[PDB]
Specification:
This is part of a larger assembly, with two copies of chain A.
Chain A (H helix, E strand, L loop, with lengths): L7 H9 L4 H12 L1 H16 L1
The complex binds cholesterol hemisuccinate (4 copies).
The site of one cholesterol hemisuccinate (Y01) has 3 residues of chain B, from helix 3.
C-alpha cells in the first residue's frame, strides 16, 4: 500500500477483508452437514434401543 | 513528506516554495542600488568632462 505511516497497512487490510472467503465457506460446509450427523446419531440410538 | 511514490517530494517542495525568500530579497537589494550606481557613473563622467 502507498503509505509510510506505521499501522496504515493492517487497518486497511482489515477494512478491505474483514472475514476471508475461506472461513465463510468452511463454516457453511460444516454447518450444512450437522443435520446429517444428528440423523446418523439418532439412527444409531434407535438401532441400540432395538 | 508522508509519501512513498518517487518524485512526490520534489514536486511538492517546488509547489510549496516556488521562489525562496532569499532570492527575492537579494534581487530587491540589488535592484534598489542601481540608481545610485548610475548617479555615481554620471558624476564620474561629468568630472572627467571638466
Ligand atoms: C441442526 C439442528 C439445529 C436445530 C435442530 C432442530 C431443533 C428442534 C427439533 C425439533 C425436534 O422435535 C421432535 C426434532 C429435531 C429438530 C427438528 C432439530 C433437528 C436438528 C437441528 C435442525
Ligand atoms: C467425521 C467424524 C469425526 C465423525 C463422523 C460420524 C461420527 C460418528 C457418528 C455417530 C456416533 C455415534 C455416537 O454414539 C453415542 O453417542 C452413543 C458416538 C460417536 C459417533 C461414533 C460419531 C464419532 C465421530 C464421527 C465418526
Ligand atoms: C534604474 C534605471 C532604470 C530606468 C532608468 C531611467 C530611464 C530614463 C531616464 C530618462 C533620462 O532623461 C534625461 C534620465 C535618466 C533616466 C531617469 C534613467 C535613470 C536610471 C533608471 C531609473
Ligand atoms: C561594488 C563595485 C563592484 C562597484 C561599485 C562602484 C563601481 C564603480 C562605479 C563607477 C565606475 C566608473 C566607470 O567609468 C567609466 O565607465 C568611464 C568605470 C567603472 C567604475 C569604476 C565602477 C566599478 C565597479 C564598482 C567599484
Amino acid at each position: 500500500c502507498n503509505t509510510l505511516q506505521p499501522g496504515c497497512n493492517q487497518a486497511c487490510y482489515d477494512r478491505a477483508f474483514p472475514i476471508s472467503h475461506i472461513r465463510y465457506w468452511v463454516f457453511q460446509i460444516i454447518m450444512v452437514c450437522t443435520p446429517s450427523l444428528c440423523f446418523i446419531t439418532y439412527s444409531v440410538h434407535q438401532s441400540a434401543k432395538q
